[PDB]
Every structure is written in structure tokens, then in C-alpha cells.
DNA sequence: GAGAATCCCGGTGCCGAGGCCGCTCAATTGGTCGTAGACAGCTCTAGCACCGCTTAAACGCACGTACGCGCTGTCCCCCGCGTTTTAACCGCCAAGGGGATTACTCCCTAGTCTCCAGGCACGTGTCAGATATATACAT
DNA sequence: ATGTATATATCTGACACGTGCCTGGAGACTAGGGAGTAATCCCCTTGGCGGTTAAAACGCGGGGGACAGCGCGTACGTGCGTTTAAGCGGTGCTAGAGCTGTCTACGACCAATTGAGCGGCCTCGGCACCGGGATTCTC
């Protein structure tokens, strides 16, 4: 449906910035599966974050404190 | 002229030199839109949020592909298979 | 004096 | 002597209430005492940060409700929010 | 307004009333179902096709037509 | 006359309120939050006490050893994710042998 | 006051103990009352003001 | 010499029970000496030392489970120090 | 001789608890060194907790907090 | 007022590197960094205040906390600079 | 020895990174008191150290066989490249739905006096294991 | 000749109940400021235009890489002789853990104040972009 948006050359670019030389065809669907479950976990944090504040928008503070919640926090959008 | 591979070495050198995003913005916010509308109804979003999950996704992709690179090097192989990423997620505690 | 008192209390308890 | 704080008798007789013919050992009392104050400080902290993220200066049922809906992986939260809401309605009924 | 809400509510879901007392309202835009009262309550006495574009733009007013004027007579609803 | 009996709950509500006052979490505390804490605590220990009970009658022992709660906590994925990172004293290893590692 | 089923507006015979919604027969308890999402209950009971 | 049957019974006999493997007095001086690195003649504690014993046993069994899973990945039962280095590097260190 | 105080059959029992069928002979010194740096990292936090508590000896709860610190929480 | 830390590290950077600038995205990155370390050490100060029941936080407790979470020679330089900073406070 | 594919040197708007004034809250200074940190002093738990019997666990040498490893023939499936084509992205325009904030308000949670029974601590009885008799029967 | 079967008879051994007690949770009274609501302005983002264009999909030649298979040796498993220094357990000694008492000075609180960092506005040059020439692995 809309899960092929991260198509084969995008995963190839992610592999080339990740350090892997040769790519087999079965890597792509597994990488987009772990991407669509990892972003599912982040959005699963963000929905409870939004419904807590009675606020229907998701800001950069939402995802930054959510990454702080799973212990993979990121600098640049608040601390 | 025609090589088995040398363009990949220049590509990985240029990508380790550069710092630009290699994931297109429109399919990314489209897929997080589909996930958000699958979870709840009628949500609003900000742009700094979606470049923040773009940064999180590219950092997680870089970490996982470094993990699969080290696992493939220790497996004495050049081509990568999903067994390495499965063992990488099992070892790191992502799935169990 | 504390050790002698403790020994006397222990002897009385025994 | 010292007045030690432990909820060992509470876990002991909910064990007796739900399992009338089952015994237990003192190492077990110490081990789920470590469990319940582990989760007590964990979810007391969670709500704290969250409410402060929300910039609220208190802790009512709302912050801890979203904290326990967010924190643990599943199932136990699905029964837990229902039974906690039922608990606060018997409190407000009384 | 129903003449007797106690007696009308025990027979308005039968098939002998839904052919006559069901109003289907179409929204404007550019294992049998006979024995299940969900299909009678939602889609009336006609079978439901989820692939028809005009089908999912439809109300079915079967119970509410006598339910909403009874709130004046019984405010507990 | 106790507030735990007024709430209908068994886990104490004045004790967690006392631990919430000087636990330095919030300067203002609502009334229903310690009740909600006691409710989720009672639910968590009720669930693993059912698990320790069925492990105890699986091994046919009247006393729940901590090993019983090890194979009670490793038999469900929700507590395998909630208590996967934890380290347990005298826990042992669950029976798990790979099919390839077995001979023939 | 007469009891009524909150799903269909019918005559309510049974109230579910898990979530306190009155229902008329078995199948609304099967595919509506049981698999309903949490939070749907509060504006489900807002009509009769039972929340 | 019967190969594999005694090893299988051995694997079952320490995958069934919960006995202690590390001896208490060697590990005692071990951590006592690691302690001297910071505090010398550090009066010690029995609860402290069985805390380090169970923590070290849990870390050892986790690292060794990681090592034998990534060895069964590598189509070879036996263990090399590069397997331990791979497990340490991938696991976070 | 603090390195060879811990016996090789104890590492054998640790390997058989981990599920190791065949184990080499060069694994023991490297495993011992990794265990030494792990226990040194733990006992550094433990000894800073002993200097926290105005005590010249170790106890239970300092080791408890030192195990809760880095994410291997003790139970 | 909307609090930040821009002019502070701009003055610090002019003290250490008087011919070097920085960007606003990087300024936000170090804002997230300073908020992260401040929240981490304040949470540590609260928890090792709570361990030994002490209701007051003094310099020695969070001194031992920065001996705790920071590694060795950075902790030595940090505790030396911190001790000279509090002794040039209490000298005045 | 050639050739795509790099690195390097020079011009060009530009648009996003340094000053500056206005000024408004926020850091600074001073007085007061009531409590918690620190020091002194106190009682006993428990950690350290050494002696000696028991002995099951550990070292060491001997050998044997599957398993790690070296090499080999093979499909064959990914890799470079030409050709459509199809969605991405830039520039822009208007809406309107949602975020911030002002502004009173009221209630309920902070804080304090009292007091009694809930839970903690310390005794006594009451069903599970261990040796022993013992004598006739069956193997 | 010996196990044994099934009940003794003593007989300890680990575990759950019946009295003290003390202290903190609950009932009752006072206050004030923190959510509660809501209205209004403004701002940004979600749709919708359309060109055009780097880039994905698709198919095809080709080449090393992965697959099972077979032999060579040796390393860990197994075993028995010979230690050994772990374990129990026992006793003796004394540091130090822990509780109490008391003091007093750092620090929360409150009122007034001054000043400096936030921001809108203004101005200008560092870097990406483009164009063309040197240079280096590769065939």
C-alpha cells in the first residue's frame, strides 16, 4: 500500500552510509519491517503523549522526549 | 572502463564524507501519516517533528547496518543475509 | 565495665 | 528495635486470599519486596517527568493513567487501567 | 412519537416492520444476515455490499425515530 | 474507617501516600493517584502470584521457590519484555537447547 | 426508570460486568461490547450520563 | 570413550538445577583485591559478596549465551576469543 | 595470583550453564580479563558509594545501587 | 522571559576561540546537550540525596556523583576545577 | 598504453549568520528564624583471622575419534548498463482550524491538633522426616 | 540367605497463632492559589494547482560467490592416579555500625531593586553552485 515508499535505492543508500558492501534482495523487506515496527513504537509513545496533554499535534519535543523514553535520545530539538 | 566494483567504494567514501539525509521526505511523512491515521483519527503534525524522526530513522539505520557489517565480517562473508540482522536484533535485546 | 556487665548478663541468662 | 517498612504481609495474604493452601519462604518476601519498590519508584518517576513535561505541578489520576497506559508492554495495562478506574469509583462512591 | 414505547420496542426490529418503517438517508457526494439483528439495526432488511460506493454513505433510521421523542416522556434516556 | 477499606482495595493507600509525600516526586498530590498506584500494584502482584501458583502446582511444591517465579516470568512475552533487562539472583537458565546443537 | 441496551436502544436484559454497558442479546456482546476500544465507553455512557 | 552423551547429561544437569559455580573464597579475594584498587583492607560484607557473585554469574551466562548463539550462527560449535570480542562489541561495549 | 585464583572448571560450569558444548583453552584468560574489568567497573561505583555513606566498609545497598546504575538491575 | 544559554557559551567561545563562530542548529544541539546533562546530574543529585535520607544537597554529594557518572581523568579535572571554584567562592 | 571519474582553481548572487538598541522581567541584596547537618558520645553486632578434620573437587598424563579446516566443481543470482515513465519537488495561493494567552474563579489540596487501633515484634503448639523393632513370606 | 512390608515407637524439626505497643493514618478545621473555562487573535499546514526532471522499473549480458562434498589431522572428551586446599565449624578479638543528644549556622522566606539577556531590525561576506582544467586507478 504505502510501505514501499522506502524503496530499494533508499535502503541501498542507507546500506552505503551504514558500511555494507554487497546487498541481497531479502535485506530490503526485513529492513523496512524493522523500520515500520521501530517507528510504530515511537508513534505508540507519541499517541499517549498527545492524548495526555489533550493536544492533537505532534511536535519535535514529542518525539525528542519519546526518544528520551526509549533511551535513544537526540540533540537539536530540545532537551 | 567496466569494473566489478569500484563505484561503490567512491560512494561509501562520499557518503561517509557527507552528512546529508539519504531518505526522501515525502514517502517518510506519508508512511508516518498512514501509521498515525491507523492508530487514531485526525492528528496534526509539525515539520520539525518529521525531520526529527528522519534523523532518528537514519541514525538507527546507520547503527543497524554497522551491526550487520560487523556480523558479516565475523561470519567471513561479504554479501549480507537476514540471518545477520535477525541475530543482531536478538543479541541487542530489541526482540527478546 | 561494659564487657564485665555483658559477661554477667550472659552468665545470668545461661 | 527499628521500625522496618515492608509490604510482606500484604503480598502474603493476597497470596493467602487467592491461593488458600500455598506456602512461601522469606527470600520470596524479600524478592518481591524488591519488585514492588522497583516498580514503585519507576512509575513514580515516570509520572513525575511526564507531568513536568506537561508543565503540570501535581499528580492526579490522569498523569499516572497515561503513564501506566504507556509504560509496561501490554495486557497487564489493559486490565490495570480498568481495575484502577473501578477502584477510584468505589473510592468516590464511599 | 410512539403510542406505546414498551410495546413498540419489542417488534420494531422484526422484518415485517423494517420493510415499511425504515428510512435510508444517503449522504451527498460527487451466518445469514436475516437472523442477525446487527444487520437489521445497521443495514436494515436489505443485504449489505461493502464494495458499493453509494452503500457506505447511508443512514438507517429504525429505532431512533421512536427513541428520541421518548426522551421528553422519560428523561433518564 | 481506613481509607483502603473505603476504596475497597487490599494494598494499603495511606502507606503509598506517605511514601509519595516525602518521596520528592511532586509538590502537590491528588487523592486518586495513590489509589491508582495501589490498584496497579495489586494487579501486577495478583498476576504474577497466579503465575507463581501455576508454576508451583506444575512442579508440585507447596512453597514457591524463586526458580518457580523464573519459569513463571519467562513463560510470557509481556514480562519477558518488562523484565528482560533485569538480572535475578539465583535464577538459573530456562530449558532451551537448539535443534541443530542436538546430535542427529 | 426502564433499563435499555446502550448499543441498539432495545430492551436491556444483561449488563456486562467488565465495562458496565447494558445489552439486549448475545451477539452484540460478542462483536460489539467485547472487542470495543478503551475510551469508547465514556461517550457510550454519556448518552444516559452514567460516566 | 563415549562422546556427547555425558556432555548432554552435563548440559541438562546444570540447566535443571540452580547451584553456584564460582567458589566463594577465590572470588572473595578477587573482588577484595579489585576493592583494594580503590579501598585497601576494605572491611567487606557477605551480602555484598554474594551480590557480586550473582551479578558476575548472570553477566557470564548472558555473555556465554550470546557467544554460543553467535557460534551456532557461524556453523561451528567451538569458541574463539574473537567471538567474545564480537559479542562485547555488538552488545554495546 | 589473583588472576588464577578463579578455577578453570568454574569457567567450565559457567560455559555449561550458558549452553556451550565445545570450548577452547585460550578463552579462560580473556574471559577472566573481561570479568576483571566488569567487576572493577562495578566496584568503582560501589567504593564511591562507600565514601558517600561515611563508612570504611561495604554493605548491601551500595552494591544494590551500583547494580541499578548501569542497567543490570539486581533482584 | 524565554530562558536559553546563547550569550553564555558565545562569551565562553570568545574566551577560548576568539576567531571561531557557530551556527544556530548547532546552538540548539548544545542547548539540548546542556539540558540533558543538567537534568541527568540533577536527577542523580536527587537520588543520592534520597539514598542516605539527607534532605539537603551539598557540594560533596554531587561531587561524588560526578566521580560516579564521569570516567577517570575527566572526573579528576572536573573535581579540581570545582574545588578551586568553590574555594574562590568561599574566599570572597 | 586509454577513460570515466575524480580533485582543484576561479567567478557569483544570496540569504542566512553577526551587531544594536528597547526594555522587561529576573538575578541580586538584606533581614529573620527554625530546623537539619555535624560533631561528640554511647552500646553491641558482626567482620576478620587462625586451627584442624574431612574429602570431593581439581591437576596431569594417555589416547581416540569426530569435527575444524583445506580444496574443488558448480549453477546462478546479483551487478553494470540502456530505455521508458512516473512520481518527487519546487513556487505559490488561500483557509480555517487549531495553538497561546489573557482573566476571573472556586475548591481542594497544603498545613496543623488530636487519638486510637494497624501492623510490627516476640513467645508457644502442631503436623512432616529419620531410626528402629520384627517376624513371617517369598525370592 | 536375605530383602521386605507394613505397622509400630520415639522423637526431633520447621512452621503458624495469641499477647504488648506505639506511632502514624484518619477525623476535623483553615487558606489561597492552581486548574478550569473560554474568547480572541494569529499562524501554519493541510489541499491544490502545474511544469519538469532526477530517478525508479524493467530487461539483459556476465562473473565471481555461495552451495555441497570429500579427505587430513588433531584437540577436546573420557578416565584413573594423585594431590589440595575448599568447606565446616569453632573460637577469640575488636573495629566500627548504629542510635541518641545537643548545638548553631546554612538556608528558605520576604520585600525592594537594578541590569542584562530576548528580540525585531539591520547589514554583509562564506559557502554552495557552476565551468573548465589537472590527475589518478582501472582496463
Numbering used by the authors:
A (entry chain F): 24 to 102
B (entry chain E): 40 to 135
C (entry chain Z): 254 to 267
D (entry chain H): 28 to 121
E (entry chain R): 253 to 282, 584 to 630
F (entry chain G): 15 to 118
G (entry chain S): 112 to 162
H (entry chain A): 41 to 133
From the paper:
S.c INO80 is a multi-subunit complex consisting of 15 subunits that are divided into three different modules. The catalytic module with the Ino80 (ATPase) RecA lobes and insert, Arp5, Ies6, Ies2, Rvb1 and Rvb2, constitutes the core unit of INO80 (C-module).
The most substantial difference in the structure is the location of the Arp8 module as detailed below. Thus on 0/40 nucleosomes, the Arp8 module and HSA no longer contact the flanking DNA.
